Design a binder for this molecule. Structure first.
Ligand SMILES: [Mg+2]
Length: 247
């Protein structure tokens, strides 16, 4: 991975030693990006509901994962399940249980730095993964992207700055998440997010991530070309809010 500092350096070191899982996968992959495009053609707001019990920005809740997933199944275009353990209180069992309980596409969200973590996502029933430009070298990102596609997944390539965007387009990303949160510092910058969104080709499926709580922001971003919206904290604290956000 890249050389990092602070908590990101720690979580990458932890991820490098993550024990892999063994399991026979049951259901073919169903594509999250393709379902997003279908929602766009149907003019249905496409929200990826994220399940995470804890976060570095201070979320700390207990909520049953299956009841959350089954509720979101009716409304969300997909789910994003945190599997990182130390900072997000996620687990592989959580992903396995959710994936086996719903029929909508599932993204495994973690700090992926080795191929076995992609194996883990597949073997646990996820349909895709996030890959984070700012923790990986360009060579690693190219290699892990090809590896994920070899399973039939189209990973969400996460970007936060213009360097990240240059790498993401260079390596052939077709599904990009534009996060307004700098994961190192937790700083939110929506202006920079919008600038990056305006710089992405039309044919890349774009997901706006982080700090989203209100329908009017979703509406503004959709007008700018965003195809789907990753929403975690607001839904973890009031799940029913998704109904208003998709109205
Ligand atoms: Mg994300």
């Amino acid at each position: 991975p890249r050389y990092l500092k602070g908590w990101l350096e720690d979580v990458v070191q932890l991820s490098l030693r993550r024990p892999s899982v063994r399991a026979s996968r049951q259901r073919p992959i169903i594509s999250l990006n393709e379902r997003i495009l279908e929602f766009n053609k149907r003019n249905i707001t496409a929200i990826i509901a994220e399940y995470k019990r804890k976060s570095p920005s201070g979320l700390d809740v207990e909520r049953d994962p299956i009841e959350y997933a089954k509720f979101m199944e009716r409304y969300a275009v997909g789910l994003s399940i945190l599997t990182e353990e130390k900072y997000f209180n996620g687990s592989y069992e959580t992903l396995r249980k959710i994936a086996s309980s719903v029929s909508i596409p599932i993204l495994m969200a973690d700090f992926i730095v080795k191929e076995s973590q992609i194996d883990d996502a597949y073997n646990l029933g996820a349909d895709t993964v996030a890959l984070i430009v700012k923790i990986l070298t360009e060579r690693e990102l190219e290699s892990l992207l090809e590896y994920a596609r070899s399973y039939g997944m189209e990973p969400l390539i996460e970007i936060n700055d213009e360097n990240d965007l240059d790498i993401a387009l260079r390596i052939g990303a077709r599904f990009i998440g534009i996060t307004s949160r700098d994961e190192e510092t937790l700083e939110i910058n929506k202006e920079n997010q919008r600038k990056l969104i305006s710089m992405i080709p039309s044919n890349v499926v774009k997901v706006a991530e982080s700090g989203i709580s209100e329908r009017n922001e979703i509406e503004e971003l959709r007008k700018l070309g965003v195809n789907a919206f990753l929403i975690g904290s607001s839904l973890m604290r009031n799940p029913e809010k998704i109904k208003e956000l998709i109205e």
